[model samples]
Target: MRVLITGCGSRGDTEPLVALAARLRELGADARMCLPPDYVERCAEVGVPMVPVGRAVRAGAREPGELPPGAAEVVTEVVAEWFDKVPAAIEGCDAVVTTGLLPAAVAVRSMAEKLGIPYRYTVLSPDHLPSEQSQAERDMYNQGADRLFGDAVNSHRASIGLPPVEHLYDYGYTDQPWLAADPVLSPLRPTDLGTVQTGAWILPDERPLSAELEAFLAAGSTPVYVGFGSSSRPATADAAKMAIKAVRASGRRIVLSRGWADLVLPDDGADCFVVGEVNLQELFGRVAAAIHHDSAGTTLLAMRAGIPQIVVRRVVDNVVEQAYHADRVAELGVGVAVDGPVPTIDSLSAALDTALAPEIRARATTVADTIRADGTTVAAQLLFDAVSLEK
Candidate 1:
């Protein structure tokens, strides 16, 4: 059975689909994919054939010095392009599966239904799931969804002979959705949608750390790891500096990943090392603790490695998902969450103090053992069986 899998956004957005696609291929199922142009090479490494969809999620998402309003238009353009570029790829697939940023997923969902194919949707986090929202929350989300996708999406749906979607959240998320998150790290809360709680879908990373990185790790006591996930503004200048100060106070060396944010050190120091993307699974295992903005992918990686964490939240009132993971760290007694929307050196350093305690580290190790790496395998098998029964 040929299946089309799509997850369009940053590397975090597309990661699980790649994992599921790779797992399907491993199990001898035919897995096709639709991904952003910048990430197409990832599919090649695994031999999963993909039609590179529209603009790359992060490559020139906006011109340097472009204003915030312009960013919204970029998303709309990507959605419109998908309506144009993706259908021909979907034409031959037995089913279409997508999980990631909502706008791109919405485009794929509508197109799949238009083409009369089975469409399955998955979410990497519980907040993204259709949940019990306050009336105000629901209204705001609904309005935002409609504003981003309403006109362009329905106009194209008309061309494809499909009905216009009134409630983008309800229609885009569907009646049921798969929650591809680790039950231990991101447990599924009760929600309005019928959700399947599959464990987190992660590709097993066997790539070894680079020789230079190996020397860094060997040179110090297990260093703290600091890396924001693939987002442009996960950290501010002050917050980044505070995080480094906090790590140093904790008496651990640092392995800093420059991720999508392009963070840099306050100054060069032998105690800290900066890197771009590296093998997380290989690196996480060796780190003393993880200090991050609590992105889902990075949080799960740190959790499975059985290390303490210091989670920093980028915002408060606006409902940053990172805050949820940050709370989970405290609730689970695995690490610490820096207080408030932004960090002070005092707040961050204090959090580091708590996180470095032996008990927290031990608790992290205990929790890590409970997280499984089998989520993608389960989702892949479920899709395979469903396709088989239909045939």
Candidate 2:
């Protein structure tokens, strides 16, 4: 059997699919990646077949700090242009895997059905699960592009008979005031592939940490861990800096993540070391405390590690709806969400006083112990079993 997995966005979005493809290869299934051209080299280096999709848009996504309006318009054009190579890949592959809420997922899902191919959706974060704001933001993005560019996406949907354009009236946008209603779709689901809840989708050959990273974890001083997840913006950076300052004020060390966005640490290396694109769960075992823009994936990673967390949330993708998870973790003694206008050094520092207390540590340990009881491998195996049964 073969698989075609397509996802867009940052490295976080593409890397998981790379890991999954690698796993499928280990299981003797051929896997090819459908992503923007910018990532082809890296995916190839990782030994995944690179089936270029939005070659220009993916590569040109960043004109500087962000995509220019024209650039976003071009990306829409390129996505609509994918059928040239994408349809052929889909026709040959037995299954299609996708991530996030791209119109691409719906497109592939429809094609897979037509071709009698199995299509499964995977989400990197619960953020893909819609909240009213996310849908509105996406619709706003699409509408802005449609007025400026041609109706490329709507045209594609019509041509493919995918559905009417009304479904995207809000592009998932709308001010319907449905706060009390449950989401129509959620990113979370029990693995149909098996009984295991890996809490992640990964390949068997994938090691969560490098040997140097493991040693660092074993020997490094108690430090804070910080990353913005996929949408860590200026606010997250500011908040992280605030938390780091608080850590230093209380006389502590820190491990800063220079993720998709660069780390904004002050000129003090004495308390911080910047790491680029490393796994959080792998590093959680060594950190004193974690300060991050709350992402469900990262929260789960930290939860299993049993570390205390300071969640800086801005509700960019409904991911900041972590109060319940925070409550659960806080009750179990793991972390707390510092939501709102981001935290200042004084405020974050104050929160850390409570987060780092011996009592909180004790509670975090209990929760961590329970979470560790579940292995990610079990989830992977389950995914395979379920997919196999679909055959």
Q: Which candidate is the best by lDDT?
A: 1
Q: What is the C-alpha lDDT profile of model 1 across 136-169, one tens digit per residue?
A: 7866877888987787888888878987886777
Winning candidate number (TM-score): 1
Residue 151 local lDDT, model 1 = 78
The lDDT values for all models are 0.78, 0.58
Candidate 2 residue pairs in backbone clash = 135-172, 135-173, 136-173, 170-173, 193-382, 193-383, 193-386, 194-382
Model 2 lDDT per residue over 5-29, tens place: 7776565566667777777786687
RMSD of each: 2.8, 6.6
* Ten-residue stretch with the least lDDT total in model 1: 61-70
